């Protein structure tokens, strides 16, 4: 179930889509986000994802909308291309694992200001096999 901690994460989550604190994520903030991550979606494609979204249709993603979205347990086989093409992002040179440096690199054009402390923790919450780094089988599970 969420919990307390989970709860403050999802708002970190979404203050990073939130580029302007408005308490709304618009198709303009989603798809600067995206070209962030090297991925490029038409104004269209744009407006298809936050109508996934989009409970209320105001044509924005509020907090509440938001956290419906990440809590809903979505299982594999249900885009599992998506998947590979998020692991691509993060494994920069290919080599099959998410190193520390890898994703201090993705979450700097994000926006975000992490410590040393903080990406080891993030890694080691998702590594299994404990070897300091996230291979595609260990990444997979994070998600589902
Ligand atoms: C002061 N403020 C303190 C919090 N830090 C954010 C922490 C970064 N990070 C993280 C690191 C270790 C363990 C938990 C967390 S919470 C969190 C939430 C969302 C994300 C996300 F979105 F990337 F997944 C990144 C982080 C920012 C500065
Ligand atoms: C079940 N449970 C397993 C693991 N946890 C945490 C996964 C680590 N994770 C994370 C941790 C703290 C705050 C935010 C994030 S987002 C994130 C993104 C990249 C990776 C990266 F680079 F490793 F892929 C790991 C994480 C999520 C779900
Ligand atoms: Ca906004
Ligand atoms: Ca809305
Ligand atoms: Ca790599
Ligand atoms: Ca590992």
Redo the contacts with the bound molecule.
Sequence with gaps: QLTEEQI???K??FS?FDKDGDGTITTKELGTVMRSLGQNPTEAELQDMINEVDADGNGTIDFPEFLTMMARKMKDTDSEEEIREAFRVFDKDGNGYISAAELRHV?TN?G???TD???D??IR?ADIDGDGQVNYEEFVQMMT
């Design positions: 403050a994460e999802f970190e989550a990073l979450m994000l975000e200001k992490l402390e903080e990406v923790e993030m919450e």
